[PDB]
Design a protein around this ligand. Structure first.
Ligand SMILES: NC(=O)c1ccc[n+]([C@@H]2O[C@H](COP(=O)([O-])OP(=O)(O)OC[C@H]3O[C@@H](n4cnc5c(N)ncnc54)[C@H](OP(=O)(O)O)[C@@H]3O)[C@@H](O)[C@H]2O)c1
Ligand SMILES: CCc1nc(N)nc(N)c1OCCCOc1ncccc1C#CCO
Ligand SMILES: [Cl-]
Length: 166
């Protein structure tokens, strides 16, 4: 349960088994089960994303519905129609429950404040290339639950992890 006076911070991402989450301004796969899972977890809460993740969303779909959208940027002239742009995590983490939805830079930025991670891992062989966005690495203060491999309608294995710390 989340007390309304708290500030719970979770990270949610999908990665290949290599840890790649992003390449060329996009996610280098599509997985409907992951899209459904992402929506189930985040709906009704504030979502925080880096400016490059906002850019990766088609204009027609953003801001993502049913959630307060907040975008992190250091550029004083970057604007996100329908959403709030702020310059720091201190400004972005004011709701009782916030999901940080990417990308690589913002996961690393938010990790010190996070107590939950929800991961989808896709069994697609995409080794790391220069310039890729990568999942954050989780140290021994975290404890994880790893689901068994499941099989998507699109013919990829995937599995879910849930990590927590105090
Ligand atoms: N598979 C997934 O789950 C997933 C999820 C989300 C995104 N992605 C993919 O990941 C990639 C994007 O990730 P990325 O690491 O390149 O960028 P990102 O983390 O989405 O955004 C980086 C931007 O956030 C701003 N930023 C970074 N640190 C900041 C700070 N301390 N304070 C204020 N603003 C800060 C900066 O914006 P300014 O340059 O405007 O200052 C920076 O350029 C894309 O390929 C995307 O498709 C994948
Ligand atoms: C659904 C992808 C995703 N999955 C998990 N598990 N965590 C995330 N943070 C996450 O990224 C959400 C922001 C980026 O979204 C997209 N980026 C590129 C192409 C499509 C989408 C989409 C969508 C909604 O269907
Ligand atoms: Cl969505």
């Amino acid at each position: 349960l989340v007390p309304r006076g708290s500030h719970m911070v979770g990270l949610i991402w999908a990665q290949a088994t290599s840890g790649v989450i992003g390449r060329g301004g996009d996610i280098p796969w599509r997985l409907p089960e992951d899209q459904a899972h992402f929506r189930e977890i985040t709906m009704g809460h504030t979502i925080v994303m880096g400016r490059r993740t906002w850019d990766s969303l088609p204009a027609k779909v953003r801001p993502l519905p049913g959630r307060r959208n907040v975008v992190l940027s250091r550029q004083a002239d970057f604007m996100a129609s329908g959403a709030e742009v702020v310059g720091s995590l201190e400004e972005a983490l004011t709701s009782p429950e916030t999901w940080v939805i990417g990308g690589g830079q913002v996961y690393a930025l938010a990790l010190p404040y996070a107590t939950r991670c929800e991961v989808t891992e896709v069994d697609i062989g995409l080794p790391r290339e220069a310039g890729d966005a990568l999942a954050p690495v989780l140290d021994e203060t975290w404890r994880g639950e790893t689901g068994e491999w499941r099989f998507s309608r699109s013919g990829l294995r995937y599995r879910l992890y849930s990590y927590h710390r105090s």
